[PDB]
């Protein structure tokens, strides 16, 4: 019946699903890399303390 909504429904659907997944990817990357950094900071102090 209506062609343009047929056309753009999944276009917009996937575009915004991927925008949401991009926010998700940046969030997971940020938090996991922060985990990496803080974890290295945690371990280095522990080892240095022990062996000092």
């Amino acid at each position: 019946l209506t062609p343009n909504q047929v056309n753009d429904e999944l276009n917009k659907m996937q575009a915004f699903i991927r925008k949401e997944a991009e926010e998700k990817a940046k969030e997971i990357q940020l938090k996991a890399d922060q985990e990496y950094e803080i974890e290295k900071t945690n371990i280095v102090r522990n080892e240095t303390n022990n062996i000092d």
């Binding site: 343009n4 909504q5 753009d8 429904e9």
Partner: protein
């Protein structure tokens, strides 16, 4: 025939176009509207008539907006219908409905003879 937000409910046979235009508006030029008239019209109690009723099927990305959808529908006319977007659960629904279906019709004939005698 179809096409986590799909809704289903009873829509007045006559007022179908009113709903279609209200949708035309509320969803702002984006809709997937599929409805068919219901043969064998049905009864009611609000007006207590053998009314003429239809049903609706629509999909769209609104998740919280469905609040307004169901609210307006019921305030006008609607019967909640938890449905499935495929025909697999169709079998489950057939089974569950047939459960009561097998016996429903007794009530009347049972009630008859007692009051008669």
């Amino acid at each position: 025939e179809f096409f986590v937000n799909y809704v289903t409910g009873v829509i007045a046979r006559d007022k179908v176009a009113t709903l279609e235009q209200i949708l035309w508006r509320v969803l702002r030029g984006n809709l997937f509207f599929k409805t068919v008239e219901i043969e064998q019209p049905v009864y009611d109690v609000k007006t207590r008539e053998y009314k003429h009723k239809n049903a609706f099927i629509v999909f769209s990305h609104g998740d919280l907006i469905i609040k307004r959808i169901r609210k307006i529908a019921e305030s006008l006319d609607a019967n909640l219908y938890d449905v499935d977007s495929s025909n697999e659960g169709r079998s489950q629904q057939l089974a569950k409905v047939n459960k009561n279906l097998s016996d429903l019709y007794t009530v009347l004939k049972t009630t008859s003879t007692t009051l008669e005698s």
